[PDB]
Design an enzyme around this catalytic site. Structure first.
Site, PDB file in Angstrom:
ATOM      1  N   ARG A  33     -49.419 -20.526  -5.462  1.00  0.00           N
ATOM      2  CA  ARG A  33     -47.999 -19.273  -5.878  1.00  0.00           C
ATOM      3  C   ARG A  33     -46.473 -20.248  -5.605  1.00  0.00           C
ATOM      4  O   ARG A  33     -46.077 -20.732  -4.372  1.00  0.00           O
ATOM      5  CB  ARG A  33     -47.940 -17.914  -5.131  1.00  0.00           C
ATOM      6  CG  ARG A  33     -46.941 -16.894  -4.772  1.00  0.00           C
ATOM      7  CD  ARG A  33     -46.349 -15.991  -4.797  1.00  0.00           C
ATOM      8  NE  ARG A  33     -47.714 -14.971  -4.754  1.00  0.00           N
ATOM      9  CZ  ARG A  33     -48.676 -14.628  -3.407  1.00  0.00           C
ATOM     10  NH1 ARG A  33     -48.352 -14.531  -2.551  1.00  0.00           N
ATOM     11  NH2 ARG A  33     -50.150 -13.460  -4.068  1.00  0.00           N
ATOM     12  N   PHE A  55     -37.458 -18.648  -5.161  1.00  0.00           N
ATOM     13  CA  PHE A  55     -37.514 -18.098  -4.408  1.00  0.00           C
ATOM     14  C   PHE A  55     -38.633 -19.214  -3.295  1.00  0.00           C
ATOM     15  O   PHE A  55     -37.065 -19.352  -2.372  1.00  0.00           O
ATOM     16  CB  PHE A  55     -38.477 -16.661  -5.013  1.00  0.00           C
ATOM     17  CG  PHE A  55     -39.044 -16.134  -4.002  1.00  0.00           C
ATOM     18  CD1 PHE A  55     -38.730 -16.252  -2.711  1.00  0.00           C
ATOM     19  CD2 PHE A  55     -39.861 -15.515  -3.981  1.00  0.00           C
ATOM     20  CE1 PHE A  55     -39.208 -15.127  -1.306  1.00  0.00           C
ATOM     21  CE2 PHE A  55     -41.001 -14.495  -3.194  1.00  0.00           C
ATOM     22  CZ  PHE A  55     -39.728 -14.237  -1.599  1.00  0.00           C
ATOM     23  N   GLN A  77     -45.520 -21.629  -1.575  1.00  0.00           N
ATOM     24  CA  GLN A  77     -46.402 -20.658  -1.253  1.00  0.00           C
ATOM     25  C   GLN A  77     -47.436 -21.866  -0.728  1.00  0.00           C
ATOM     26  O   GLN A  77     -48.078 -21.897  -2.253  1.00  0.00           O
ATOM     27  CB  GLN A  77     -46.726 -19.529  -1.285  1.00  0.00           C
ATOM     28  CG  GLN A  77     -47.439 -18.685  -0.277  1.00  0.00           C
ATOM     29  CD  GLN A  77     -47.343 -17.267  -0.004  1.00  0.00           C
ATOM     30  OE1 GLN A  77     -47.006 -16.898  -0.831  1.00  0.00           O
ATOM     31  NE2 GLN A  77     -48.613 -16.706   0.033  1.00  0.00           N
ATOM     32  N   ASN A 135     -47.520 -13.672   5.519  1.00  0.00           N
ATOM     33  CA  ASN A 135     -48.599 -12.643   6.104  1.00  0.00           C
ATOM     34  C   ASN A 135     -48.605 -12.163   5.258  1.00  0.00           C
ATOM     35  O   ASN A 135     -48.405 -12.075   4.418  1.00  0.00           O
ATOM     36  CB  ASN A 135     -47.539 -12.252   7.786  1.00  0.00           C
ATOM     37  CG  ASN A 135     -46.273 -11.581   7.086  1.00  0.00           C
ATOM     38  OD1 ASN A 135     -46.226 -10.893   5.552  1.00  0.00           O
ATOM     39  ND2 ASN A 135     -45.615 -12.309   7.707  1.00  0.00           N
ATOM     40  N   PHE A 148     -44.661 -20.492   3.279  1.00  0.00           N
ATOM     41  CA  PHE A 148     -43.775 -21.018   2.683  1.00  0.00           C
ATOM     42  C   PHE A 148     -42.868 -21.942   2.467  1.00  0.00           C
ATOM     43  O   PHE A 148     -42.183 -22.023   4.094  1.00  0.00           O
ATOM     44  CB  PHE A 148     -43.830 -19.814   1.520  1.00  0.00           C
ATOM     45  CG  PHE A 148     -42.740 -18.829   1.956  1.00  0.00           C
ATOM     46  CD1 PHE A 148     -43.360 -17.818   3.504  1.00  0.00           C
ATOM     47  CD2 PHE A 148     -41.347 -18.490   2.027  1.00  0.00           C
ATOM     48  CE1 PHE A 148     -42.443 -17.145   3.705  1.00  0.00           C
ATOM     49  CE2 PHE A 148     -40.688 -17.824   2.795  1.00  0.00           C
ATOM     50  CZ  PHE A 148     -40.986 -17.424   3.878  1.00  0.00           C
ATOM     51  N   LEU A 162     -36.107 -11.583   3.606  1.00  0.00           N
ATOM     52  CA  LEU A 162     -37.258 -12.017   4.484  1.00  0.00           C
ATOM     53  C   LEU A 162     -37.264 -12.015   6.748  1.00  0.00           C
ATOM     54  O   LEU A 162     -37.808 -12.192   7.300  1.00  0.00           O
ATOM     55  CB  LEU A 162     -38.166 -13.058   4.374  1.00  0.00           C
ATOM     56  CG  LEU A 162     -38.312 -13.079   3.250  1.00  0.00           C
ATOM     57  CD1 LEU A 162     -38.981 -14.320   2.197  1.00  0.00           C
ATOM     58  CD2 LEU A 162     -39.437 -11.329   2.035  1.00  0.00           C
ATOM     59  N   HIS A 170     -40.915 -12.323   8.627  1.00  0.00           N
ATOM     60  CA  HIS A 170     -41.332 -13.144   8.521  1.00  0.00           C
ATOM     61  C   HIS A 170     -41.299 -14.853   9.151  1.00  0.00           C
ATOM     62  O   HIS A 170     -39.767 -14.841   9.563  1.00  0.00           O
ATOM     63  CB  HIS A 170     -41.209 -14.030   6.921  1.00  0.00           C
ATOM     64  CG  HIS A 170     -42.642 -13.353   5.709  1.00  0.00           C
ATOM     65  ND1 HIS A 170     -43.757 -13.580   5.511  1.00  0.00           N
ATOM     66  CD2 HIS A 170     -42.137 -12.232   4.822  1.00  0.00           C
ATOM     67  CE1 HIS A 170     -43.564 -13.242   4.475  1.00  0.00           C
ATOM     68  NE2 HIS A 170     -42.329 -11.835   4.123  1.00  0.00           N
TER      69      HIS A 170
HETATM   70  C1  LIG Z   1     -45.694 -12.645  -3.122  1.00  0.00           C
HETATM   71  S1  LIG Z   1     -44.142 -12.787  -3.570  1.00  0.00           S
HETATM   72  C2  LIG Z   1     -43.055 -11.999  -2.047  1.00  0.00           C
HETATM   73  C3  LIG Z   1     -42.518 -10.727  -1.838  1.00  0.00           C
HETATM   74  C4  LIG Z   1     -41.726 -10.870  -0.552  1.00  0.00           C
HETATM   75  C5  LIG Z   1     -42.348 -11.121   0.251  1.00  0.00           C
HETATM   76  C6  LIG Z   1     -42.576 -12.461   0.110  1.00  0.00           C
HETATM   77  C7  LIG Z   1     -43.898 -13.080  -0.451  1.00  0.00           C
HETATM   78  C8  LIG Z   1     -44.512 -14.216  -0.508  1.00  0.00           C
HETATM   79  C9  LIG Z   1     -43.778 -15.599  -0.338  1.00  0.00           C
HETATM   80  C10 LIG Z   1     -43.472 -15.670   0.830  1.00  0.00           C
HETATM   81  C11 LIG Z   1     -43.805 -15.080   1.642  1.00  0.00           C
HETATM   82  N1  LIG Z   1     -44.815 -14.343   0.987  1.00  0.00           N
HETATM   83  C12 LIG Z   1     -46.088 -13.561   1.749  1.00  0.00           C
HETATM   84  O1  LIG Z   1     -46.384 -13.409   2.587  1.00  0.00           O
HETATM   85  C13 LIG Z   1     -46.758 -12.557   0.506  1.00  0.00           C
HETATM   86  N2  LIG Z   1     -47.669 -12.130   1.434  1.00  0.00           N
HETATM   87  C14 LIG Z   1     -49.314 -12.888   1.013  1.00  0.00           C
HETATM   88  O2  LIG Z   1     -49.246 -14.399   0.282  1.00  0.00           O
HETATM   89  N3  LIG Z   1     -49.885 -12.629   2.308  1.00  0.00           N
HETATM   90  C15 LIG Z   1     -51.221 -13.306   1.773  1.00  0.00           C
HETATM   91  C16 LIG Z   1     -51.831 -13.563   3.222  1.00  0.00           C
HETATM   92  C17 LIG Z   1     -50.759 -14.621   3.768  1.00  0.00           C
HETATM   93  C18 LIG Z   1     -51.806 -14.605   5.012  1.00  0.00           C
HETATM   94  C19 LIG Z   1     -52.532 -14.081   6.148  1.00  0.00           C
HETATM   95  C20 LIG Z   1     -53.116 -13.218   4.943  1.00  0.00           C
HETATM   96  C21 LIG Z   1     -52.693 -13.094   3.862  1.00  0.00           C
HETATM   97  C22 LIG Z   1     -54.382 -12.875   5.963  1.00  0.00           C
HETATM   98  C23 LIG Z   1     -53.893 -12.940   7.523  1.00  0.00           C
HETATM   99  C24 LIG Z   1     -53.741 -13.383   8.043  1.00  0.00           C
HETATM  100  N4  LIG Z   1     -52.685 -14.616   6.796  1.00  0.00           N
HETATM  101  C25 LIG Z   1     -55.672 -15.012   7.704  1.00  0.00           C
HETATM  102  O3  LIG Z   1     -55.083 -16.115   8.566  1.00  0.00           O
HETATM  103  C26 LIG Z   1     -56.357 -14.389   6.512  1.00  0.00           C
HETATM  104  O4  LIG Z   1     -55.544 -13.327   5.540  1.00  0.00           O
END
Ligand SMILES: CSc1ccccc1[C@H]1CCCN1C(=O)CNC(=O)NCc1ccc2c(c1)[C@@H]1C[C@H](N2)[C@H](O)CO1
Length: 164
Positions: free
Chosen positions: A54, A59, A62, A101, A112, A121, A125
């Site tokens: 991603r 921004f 990732q 997360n 990221f 964030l 995060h």
């Molecule tokens: C999408 S643009 C956005 C908008 C607002 C805010 C943030 C974001 C994005 C970009 C910055 C970080 N970001 C994000 O973090 C969004 N979230 C995930 O992608 N989540 C997927 C994920 C990650 C990590 C884990 C998992 C799922 C589970 C739990 C755990 N880790 C286990 O190892 C595996 O499955």
């Protein structure tokens, strides 16, 4: 001291260069260690051969899903997930290295690198390092992204490791 690690990145098999990261073991030792060991691959798994799934211009970039390669997976050196260590470090600007997360206490391996100040964030995060050199390589990755997060080329971490 703090570890220096690297990511060698390619786009459709063509090298983009090296990103060097400082891991803030002085502030978040558990989070820094997890990332350090995933770069070296010393636990038998890690970032080598995985993608930036991603990439959103103005921004962040990732990556870290080395299990499912689609943003649903990854795993830490401790287990499938680990708690939020602290939120001492903030998303102050471009080059900030932070944990992706699925809500509170769900850190794994996804991470990221910020291309702007992502202060919204903060407290959500875990920030655990920053770009030391190769911010031009991060900008190259960013150019292959889109507002949807989809990449126009397959962005792969061809090699990674520890420098010191
Ligand atoms: C999408 S643009 C956005 C908008 C607002 C805010 C943030 C974001 C994005 C970009 C910055 C970080 N970001 C994000 O973090 C969004 N979230 C995930 O992608 N989540 C997927 C994920 C990650 C990590 C884990 C998992 C799922 C589970 C739990 C755990 N880790 C286990 O190892 C595996 O499955």
């Amino acid at each position: 001291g703090n570890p220096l690690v690297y990511l060698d990145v390619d786009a459709n098999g063509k090298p983009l260069g090296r990103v060097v990261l400082e891991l803030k073991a002085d502030v978040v030792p558990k989070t820094a260690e997890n990332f350090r060991a995933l770069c070296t691959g010393e636990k038998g798994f890690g970032y080598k051969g995985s993608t930036f799934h991603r990439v959103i211009p103005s921004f962040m970039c990732q990556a870290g899903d080395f299990t499912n390669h689609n943003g649903t997976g990854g795993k830490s050196i401790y287990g499938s997930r680990f708690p939020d260590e602290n939120f001492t470090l903030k998303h102050v600007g471009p080059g900030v290295l932070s944990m992706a997360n699925a809500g509170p206490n769900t850190n794994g391996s996804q991470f990221f690198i910020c291309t702007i100040k992502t202060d919204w964030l903060d407290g959500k995060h875990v920030v655990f390092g920053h770009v030391i050199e190769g911010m031009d390589v991060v900008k190259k990755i960013e150019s292959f992204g889109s507002k949807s997060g989809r990449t126009s080329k397959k962005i792969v971490i061809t090699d990674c490791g520890q420098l010191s």
